[PDB]
Design a protein around this nucleic acid. Sequence first.
RNA 1: GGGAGCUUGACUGCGAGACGGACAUGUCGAGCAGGGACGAAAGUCGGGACUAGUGAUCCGGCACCUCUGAGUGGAAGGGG
RNA 2: UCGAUACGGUUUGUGUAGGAUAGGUGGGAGACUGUGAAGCUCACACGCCAGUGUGGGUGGAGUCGUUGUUGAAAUACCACUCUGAUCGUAUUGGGCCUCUAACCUCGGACCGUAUAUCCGGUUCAGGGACAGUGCCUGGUGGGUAGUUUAACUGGGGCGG
RNA 3: AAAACACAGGUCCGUGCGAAGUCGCAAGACGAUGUAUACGGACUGACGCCUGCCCGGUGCUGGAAGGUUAAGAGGACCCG
RNA 4: CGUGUAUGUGCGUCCAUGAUGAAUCAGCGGUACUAACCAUCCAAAACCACCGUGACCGCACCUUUCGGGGUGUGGCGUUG
RNA 5: AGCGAAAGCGAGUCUGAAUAGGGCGUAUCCACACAAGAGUGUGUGGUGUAGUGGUGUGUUCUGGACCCGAAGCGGAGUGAUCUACCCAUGGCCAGGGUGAAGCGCGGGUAAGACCGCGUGGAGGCCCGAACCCACUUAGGUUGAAGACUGAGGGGAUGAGCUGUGGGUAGGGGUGAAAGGCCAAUCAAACUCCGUGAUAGCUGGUUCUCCCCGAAAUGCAUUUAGGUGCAGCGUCGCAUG
RNA 6: CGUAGACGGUGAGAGCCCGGUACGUGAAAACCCGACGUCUGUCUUGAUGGUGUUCCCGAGUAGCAGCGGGCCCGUGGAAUCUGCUGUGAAUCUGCCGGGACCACCCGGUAAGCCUGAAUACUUCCCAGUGACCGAUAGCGGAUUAGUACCGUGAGGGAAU
RNA 7: AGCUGUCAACCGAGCGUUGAUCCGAGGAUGUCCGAAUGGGGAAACCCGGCACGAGUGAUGUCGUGUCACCAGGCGCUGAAUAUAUAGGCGUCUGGGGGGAACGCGGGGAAGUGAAACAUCUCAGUACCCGUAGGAAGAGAAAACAAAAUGUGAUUCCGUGAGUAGUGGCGAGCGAAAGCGGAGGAUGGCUAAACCGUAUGCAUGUGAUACCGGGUAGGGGUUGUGUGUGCGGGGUUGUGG
Lengths: 151, 63
Amino acid sequence: MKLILTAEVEHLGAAGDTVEVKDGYGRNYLLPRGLAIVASRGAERQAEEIRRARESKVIRDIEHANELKTALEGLGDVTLSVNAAGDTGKLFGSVTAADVVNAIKKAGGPNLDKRTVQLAKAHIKSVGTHPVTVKLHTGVEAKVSLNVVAQ
Amino acid sequence: AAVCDICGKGPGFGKSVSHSHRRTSRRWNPNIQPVRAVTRPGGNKQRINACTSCIKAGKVSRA
RNA sequence: GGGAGCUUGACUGCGAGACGGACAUGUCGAGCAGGGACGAAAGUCGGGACUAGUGAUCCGGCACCUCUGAGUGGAAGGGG
RNA sequence: UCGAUACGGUUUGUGUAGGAUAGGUGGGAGACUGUGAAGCUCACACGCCAGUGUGGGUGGAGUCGUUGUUGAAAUACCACUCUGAUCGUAUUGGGCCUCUAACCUCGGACCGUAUAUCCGGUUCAGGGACAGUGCCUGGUGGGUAGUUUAACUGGGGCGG
RNA sequence: AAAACACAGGUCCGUGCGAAGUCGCAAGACGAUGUAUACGGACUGACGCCUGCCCGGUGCUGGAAGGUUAAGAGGACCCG
RNA sequence: CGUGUAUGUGCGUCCAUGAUGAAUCAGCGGUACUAACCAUCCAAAACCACCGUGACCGCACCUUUCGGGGUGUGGCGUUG
RNA sequence: AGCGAAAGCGAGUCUGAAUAGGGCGUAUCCACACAAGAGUGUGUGGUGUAGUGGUGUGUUCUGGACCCGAAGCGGAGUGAUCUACCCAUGGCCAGGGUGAAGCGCGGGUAAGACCGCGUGGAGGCCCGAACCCACUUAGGUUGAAGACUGAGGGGAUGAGCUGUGGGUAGGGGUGAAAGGCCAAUCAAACUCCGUGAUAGCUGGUUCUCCCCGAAAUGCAUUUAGGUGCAGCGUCGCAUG
RNA sequence: CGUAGACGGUGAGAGCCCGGUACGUGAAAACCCGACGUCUGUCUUGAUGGUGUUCCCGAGUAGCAGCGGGCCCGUGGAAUCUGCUGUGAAUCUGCCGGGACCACCCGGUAAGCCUGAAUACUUCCCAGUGACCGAUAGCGGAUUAGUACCGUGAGGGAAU
RNA sequence: AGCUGUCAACCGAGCGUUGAUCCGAGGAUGUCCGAAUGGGGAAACCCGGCACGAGUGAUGUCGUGUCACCAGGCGCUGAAUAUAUAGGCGUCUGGGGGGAACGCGGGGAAGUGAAACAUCUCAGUACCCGUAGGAAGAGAAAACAAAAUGUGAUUCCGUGAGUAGUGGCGAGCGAAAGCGGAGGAUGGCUAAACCGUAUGCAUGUGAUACCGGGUAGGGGUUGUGUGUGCGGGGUUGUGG
Ligand SMILES: [Mg+2]
Ligand SMILES: [Mg+2]
Ligand SMILES: [Mg+2]
Ligand SMILES: [Mg+2]
Ligand SMILES: [Mg+2]
Ligand SMILES: [Mg+2]
Ligand SMILES: [Mg+2]
Ligand SMILES: [Mg+2]
Ligand SMILES: [Mg+2]
Ligand SMILES: [Mg+2]
Ligand SMILES: [Mg+2]
Ligand SMILES: [Mg+2]
Ligand SMILES: [Mg+2]
Ligand SMILES: [Mg+2]
Ligand SMILES: [Mg+2]
Ligand SMILES: [Mg+2]
Ligand SMILES: [Mg+2]
Ligand SMILES: [Mg+2]
Ligand SMILES: [Mg+2]
Ligand SMILES: [Mg+2]
Ligand SMILES: [Mg+2]
Ligand SMILES: [Mg+2]
Ligand SMILES: [Mg+2]
Ligand SMILES: [Mg+2]
Ligand SMILES: [Mg+2]
Ligand SMILES: [Mg+2]
Ligand SMILES: [Mg+2]
Ligand SMILES: [Mg+2]
Ligand SMILES: [Mg+2]
Ligand SMILES: [Mg+2]
Ligand SMILES: [Mg+2]
Ligand SMILES: [Mg+2]
Ligand SMILES: [Mg+2]
Ligand SMILES: [Mg+2]
Ligand SMILES: [Mg+2]
Ligand SMILES: [Mg+2]
Ligand SMILES: [Mg+2]
Ligand SMILES: [Mg+2]
Ligand SMILES: [Mg+2]
Ligand SMILES: [Mg+2]
Ligand SMILES: [Mg+2]
Ligand SMILES: [Mg+2]
Ligand SMILES: [Mg+2]
Ligand SMILES: [Mg+2]
Ligand SMILES: [Mg+2]
Ligand SMILES: [Mg+2]
Ligand SMILES: [Mg+2]
Ligand SMILES: [Mg+2]
Ligand SMILES: [Mg+2]
Ligand SMILES: [Mg+2]
Ligand SMILES: [Mg+2]
Ligand SMILES: [Mg+2]
Ligand SMILES: [Mg+2]
Ligand SMILES: [Mg+2]
Ligand SMILES: [Mg+2]
Ligand SMILES: [Mg+2]
Ligand SMILES: [Mg+2]
Ligand SMILES: [Mg+2]
Ligand SMILES: [Mg+2]
Ligand SMILES: [Mg+2]
Ligand SMILES: [Mg+2]
Ligand SMILES: [Mg+2]
Ligand SMILES: [Mg+2]
Ligand SMILES: [Mg+2]
Ligand SMILES: [Mg+2]
Ligand SMILES: [Mg+2]
Ligand SMILES: [Mg+2]
Ligand SMILES: [Mg+2]
Ligand SMILES: [Mg+2]
Ligand SMILES: [Mg+2]
Ligand SMILES: [Mg+2]
Ligand SMILES: [Mg+2]
Ligand SMILES: [Mg+2]
Ligand SMILES: [Mg+2]
Ligand SMILES: [Mg+2]
Ligand SMILES: [Mg+2]
Ligand SMILES: [Mg+2]
Ligand SMILES: [Mg+2]
Ligand SMILES: [Mg+2]
Ligand SMILES: [Mg+2]
Ligand SMILES: [Mg+2]
Ligand SMILES: [Mg+2]
Ligand SMILES: [Mg+2]
Ligand SMILES: [Mg+2]
Ligand SMILES: [Mg+2]
Ligand SMILES: [Mg+2]
Ligand SMILES: [Mg+2]
Ligand SMILES: [Mg+2]
Ligand SMILES: [Mg+2]
Ligand SMILES: [Mg+2]
Ligand SMILES: [Mg+2]
Ligand SMILES: [Mg+2]
Ligand SMILES: [Mg+2]
Ligand SMILES: [Mg+2]
Ligand SMILES: [Mg+2]
Ligand SMILES: [Mg+2]
Ligand SMILES: [Zn+2]
């Protein structure tokens, strides 16, 4: 099928480019790896590829870089915005990993991936401050205290 | 290996006919292949049988 | 039966009346017309003195014809 | 690596009436020098080696025409071009050595899992677009299956 | 009830390993918790002396320069 | 084999009694899974020399002088 | 209303170049003419044309089709309590002979070989009961018995016999192999179903009287003991 | 007597002897029916026919091919429908069908879904009927009847 | 007004106007096996867990509940391994089996006939498998038809018609259109395009942004893009 590249592929084309190829890539190499995408709507797919080029090229990390980023996120309270009435302080939805990666970009600033934020074990959905762990490598780990304000 | 795990496409039954018009019963079997696909974006892989029509139509994500 | 001349009747449309016959086959046939051969003409000529030298139907090929042609015009296919 | 396509630039035509190794042309009074051509130095091009187009090294400031014979003129120029020795691009096959990512492993480990030589998963190590399997296709095929294998006849058979 | 089968001994062929062979549509199983001094198949049949010729036929195994040959690619040419 | 009751020795939870094996402060000597390092098995890309060409030809050249064919060296070139 | 393969035409139509013959068709009969006696035709008049629907009988077609009868074929199931082989776990094998290796002693040997003697207890060893077979013969042969009995006979520590539990299933199993065995059955078990299988073959088919009354030949036949058509019977109608 | 002369029984052919028949009457409860209300939903911040373009009209589908199935149609010139495999479009001056195919005309609007009635049958219950059988008949079974019995078992299967 | 079912009576006892026997309706009890379901099992017989009572001097013993497996909702946890998933725990709600025929969708013979037989037939039959319902299936034109200003969803019945056809053109098989009827509902609803919304995934220009507009002010439906759900809106052939 015809895809749109998000990264560079040797002897294929440039990133952000709409390229026709056999279905082997669009089934076995490119689509699983994310260095391309199904080309659905022209503006849509172009924006998606170019935008993902921006996030992927910034969520990269190295081991000493990971230690530096842990030092960067060893900051203070990270405030979050999710609906919850003060009647019982009970959050109806599940505070998604995007809601915390964006939350720490708003509070402290450093960017990161929703893959690395251990959402399932936070015991979300109580109002107050709660701890969430984030891991980049085999050893490095960062603890983030995340809270919410009243609604 | 003649039922698709996705669309349930099973074999069909017909006759093989010789030059002397000597018909015998046989099966047209589906082209089901052992696929090992992901249900999640993350990439945990579970082995199923999928006909090549389902592979072509992208009903299974072999990510 | 032997010899020579010319020549294609080793025809087309038909056929009164018959022989033989379980049936299917088969066999003879004068005479009419077209267009010819030979003969001056009369006339004879629908292969061979005669009786063997053959294979039903089905299915298909081919050439010709003024037939048919699945809404209509063609075509394919069928038909004679 | 070879082949088929479309596209670009060198490059080609023994003839006798001759200043003619006369590609088929439309325009042809006027195109080619010192961004160093003429004539010399070689190769590229062929050579029926009869002779001619390109470069710089030299070179000095021209060659050319309905010139006339020549069917057809420039072989002075733009745009179309078969014959050919050619490279490259776009596209697609045939093959080859590969890579890993599909797929495969009754190779290891670990987990579901107290119990487990099942099974599934995760992961390392190996193969690998092969194999296996669908569909289409040619072979081999008493391994099996269904069946056929005449009659007359001084019984039937054998002969006929 | 035998001279027939089996047999210990002989050879030949296959099998490099969830082997080959067999039972199954498959998965799976036996082979074998074996690994070529092992396992399956074929013939011969303790022991002793030996086992001739023929490779044309038919199988088996091996090989490839050619001839022939499917599906699949090709669509010149022809027809409506 | 269980079960209840009453009594007897009688170790014990607490005290207390022993056994007790340590660690930190800091002085250190190797024992270290962690570069770089060494030896080992194999060939990354690779030349030389001997000897042949898978086919073409220039061949020592032979056979009824030349029918066919071919023992053998060489260059283009490698089943190498 | 028919002729034609059909388009079509229509008491006509087809063939054909043909008012030129023939095919099929124009209910049937009567007369009068006009043409030939090559079997009569043609035409004018007349007469005018008989089907259909119930139902009885005979025959026939499709159905099990007048009734009875195979060996066998297919589908789905049941069976290894008999027997064949295997798997687990047990039991049995009176009595008596023989006398293997091994060990020990001596002799003999350069050293061996080996022998003689002992202990020793081998073996699909020997004789022989229980047990397992089944070679001969006699009896039985509407038996005591759907395979026995009597007298002898082979094996009898082994490829032995045996109990209990289990596994293999029909084109399949199992077989030291006889086409053996797989529930008194096996060249493909049995049960039910297809199913009332099919049989050019055999058998059977039931009251009466009246009239008539054959054939056993020809031709063809995957035909020859079957059938079709002819011949030959009967009934009805026509003719005489 | 009769709106009752259906049919049985009673000591032999009974309308007036019995049960009944013709004809009427009856349901507390349960169940099946309707009907009227609560209830439920929708429609009305709103109607109508005009005038001129862009988008939309069921996609791994149609169509095409290979091998089959089924159509009266046994592969035939073989349409329509349909399975497996491969390839694989358009959104209306589209696409499908009208027996190969093409052109023109006509009919329709696939790849989304629901749907009553007219139709088939009888384990069981009620009420009847027979130019049906009448104990070797009729169900295998009028009586111990799927019983006794036969078979390891599927199963076979009486007589009275 | 008599009763204690019956074969099938005899004895022994009783009940009944204070309404029995009897009949109809609704209930209660309802051992064990059986889908059989706490576990096991050779069906109808063996062995339990837990909870609440009973009973004993205590164990023993008794009674009533409850305890299978799967599938789907919801809640908790999230192995290898981080995201997480597979899984695990709990609480609900269903499933399972039977049944004579009729329905639908699949698989699919052979005897037989063809005077042999293989195409063909038998026959899509017998049988098997999956599933129902009181009926099912089908059903609202991508249909017929033929130049008629024609029919109009489906199903079923009669014809057409043993016809056109088809067929080792063999034995055989065999329509539909049209036409006459039973019934009526020529019945309904979505998708898409656009508009609004909510949420998810990549994003901010983090700034003059969107809003039907003009005015003024603030300054984010994140500006945006996309996918999903919900609601409007649409539902067609003379095209809508
Ligand atoms: Mg499966
Ligand atoms: Mg079929
Ligand atoms: Mg058949
Ligand atoms: Mg593909
Ligand atoms: Mg003469
Ligand atoms: Mg002739
Ligand atoms: Mg005649
Ligand atoms: Mg003449
Ligand atoms: Mg004549
Ligand atoms: Mg024939
Ligand atoms: Mg047509
Ligand atoms: Mg036409
Ligand atoms: Mg023709
Ligand atoms: Mg492959
Ligand atoms: Mg293949
Ligand atoms: Mg064979
Ligand atoms: Mg055979
Ligand atoms: Mg047969
Ligand atoms: Mg014979
Ligand atoms: Mg004979
Ligand atoms: Mg004789
Ligand atoms: Mg004789
Ligand atoms: Mg013996
Ligand atoms: Mg004997
Ligand atoms: Mg023998
Ligand atoms: Mg041997
Ligand atoms: Mg041999
Ligand atoms: Mg094998
Ligand atoms: Mg060997
Ligand atoms: Mg022998
Ligand atoms: Mg020997
Ligand atoms: Mg020999
Ligand atoms: Mg030999
Ligand atoms: Mg030989
Ligand atoms: Mg040989
Ligand atoms: Mg040889
Ligand atoms: Mg060979
Ligand atoms: Mg092709
Ligand atoms: Mg006619
Ligand atoms: Mg003629
Ligand atoms: Mg005439
Ligand atoms: Mg009459
Ligand atoms: Mg009659
Ligand atoms: Mg049978
Ligand atoms: Mg059994
Ligand atoms: Mg001894
Ligand atoms: Mg001794
Ligand atoms: Mg012995
Ligand atoms: Mg002996
Ligand atoms: Mg003895
Ligand atoms: Mg003795
Ligand atoms: Mg004895
Ligand atoms: Mg014996
Ligand atoms: Mg004897
Ligand atoms: Mg006697
Ligand atoms: Mg006696
Ligand atoms: Mg005896
Ligand atoms: Mg005896
Ligand atoms: Mg034993
Ligand atoms: Mg057993
Ligand atoms: Mg056997
Ligand atoms: Mg029996
Ligand atoms: Mg027997
Ligand atoms: Mg059998
Ligand atoms: Mg048989
Ligand atoms: Mg039958
Ligand atoms: Mg019979
Ligand atoms: Mg008489
Ligand atoms: Mg006769
Ligand atoms: Mg007669
Ligand atoms: Mg009476
Ligand atoms: Mg549509
Ligand atoms: Mg067909
Ligand atoms: Mg067809
Ligand atoms: Mg429906
Ligand atoms: Mg009876
Ligand atoms: Mg009697
Ligand atoms: Mg009876
Ligand atoms: Mg019994
Ligand atoms: Mg009562
Ligand atoms: Mg009751
Ligand atoms: Mg139980
Ligand atoms: Mg149980
Ligand atoms: Mg659950
Ligand atoms: Mg986790
Ligand atoms: Mg059920
Ligand atoms: Mg048959
Ligand atoms: Mg037959
Ligand atoms: Mg017969
Ligand atoms: Mg009804
Ligand atoms: Mg319905
Ligand atoms: Mg009909
Ligand atoms: Mg048929
Ligand atoms: Mg909507
Ligand atoms: Mg809506
Ligand atoms: Mg219209
Ligand atoms: Zn599928």
